[PDB]
Amino acid sequence: GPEDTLPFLKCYCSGHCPDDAINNTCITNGHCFAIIEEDDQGETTLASGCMKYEGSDFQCKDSPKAQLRRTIECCRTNLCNQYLQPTLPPVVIGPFFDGSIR
């Protein structure tokens, strides 16, 4: 019956891209994703790619068995991966004191 299936999302890929990709970009009807991770030597690996359709319209979950420090992001708009670098959250502290002006 009614089934308009036509891809409409071109996202750029960094580090890892499929063997069938063109000009370092990929095409999906799902969402574009990007992930960053700190390995035992303290280098960050930046990679992005295209996610095929799954069912979730706007929900990027994670599996409940993660034993690593990392950040991840997902986006449903064109070239959202090209201009988006995943980064770890900044540090924070409640206590404060006066050290200098401005």
Q: Which two tokens stand for residue 92?
A: 């924070």
CATH number of 65's domain: 2.10.60.10
How large is the C-alpha radius of gyration of the chain? 18
Note down the domain range covering 52: 1-102
Domain count, the chain: 1
29 — alpha (psi -120 to 50), left (phi > 0) or beta? alpha
The alpha-helical segments, DSSP class H, found in 8-96 are none
How would you class 32 by CB atoms within 10 Å of its CB: exposed for 0-12, middle for 13-18, buried for 19 or more?
buried
Q: How far, in Å, are 73, 90, 91, 101 from residue 97 at the CA level?
A: 35, 19, 17, 11
| Method by which the model was determined | NMR
